[PDB]
């Protein structure tokens with residue numbers, strides 16, 4: 278139940294073998310994340326700062342509780 | 351005439367003020383580049399390794415000569 282990574286379109290867009298596991302392709306932890314109760318402006322600022330489009334949202338124990346994307350904005 | 355940076359869609363996609371200069375928004379050098387005469391395989395390997403969609407090509411003296419993009423592939 279621990280957030281171990283994140284796998285997006287850039288990771289899979291050139292992989293010819295579609296039978297590979299996620300572990301070989303994913304971006305492993307640590308990640309750029311935000312805590313629970315993050316506002317829209319804070320998430321947008323983080324995304325603009327780190328030049329990313331996704332933002333996992335974790336609790337105080339480091340467990341995954343939410344996800345934010347640029348698609349929302 | 352020096353290759354001082356690169357500016358892409360991620361840099362500009364949340365800049366409300368369109369009158370800003372390029373320098374205030376661009377990604378400054380050094381950049382992930384390749385040498386002249388780089389094959390398609392090497393360029394694709396660089397793009398996959400660094401998770402980027404562009405690749406400037408400079409000469410032996412560091413002056414910009416060309417560009418490679420994922421659009422080509």
Ligand SMILES: Nc1ncnc2c1ncn2[C@@H]1O[C@H](COP(=O)(O)OP(=O)(O)OP(=O)(O)O)[C@@H](O)[C@H]1O
Nearest residue numbers: 283284285286287288304308309329330331332401
């Ligand atoms: N929060 C994050 N922390 C760390 N790495 C991340 C994070 N979000 C995305 N990445 C990684 O950054 C790279 C690209 O990020 P992003 O998710 O914006 O790409 P994408 O949505 O696949 O892009 P495109 O839509 O242009 O194909 C990928 O390798 C992805 O795994």
Ligand SMILES: Nc1ncnc2c1ncn2[C@@H]1O[C@H](COP(=O)(O)OP(=O)(O)OP(=O)(O)O)[C@@H](O)[C@H]1O
Nearest residue numbers: 328356358359360361377381382402403404405406
């Ligand atoms: N060769 C490079 N070296 C270093 N940084 C780069 C290079 N090419 C692009 N970047 C930077 O990486 C970020 C995203 O790279 P990329 O050029 O793939 O984005 P993009 O094509 O705008 O993405 P999207 O498809 O999500 O709109 C931007 O901040 C951009 O300035």
Ligand SMILES: [Mg+2]
Nearest residue numbers: 286329330347
């Ligand atoms: Mg995207």
Ligand SMILES: [Mg+2]
Nearest residue numbers: 330347359360
């Ligand atoms: Mg995109």
Ligand SMILES: [Mg+2]
Nearest residue numbers: 286287403420
């Ligand atoms: Mg893209």
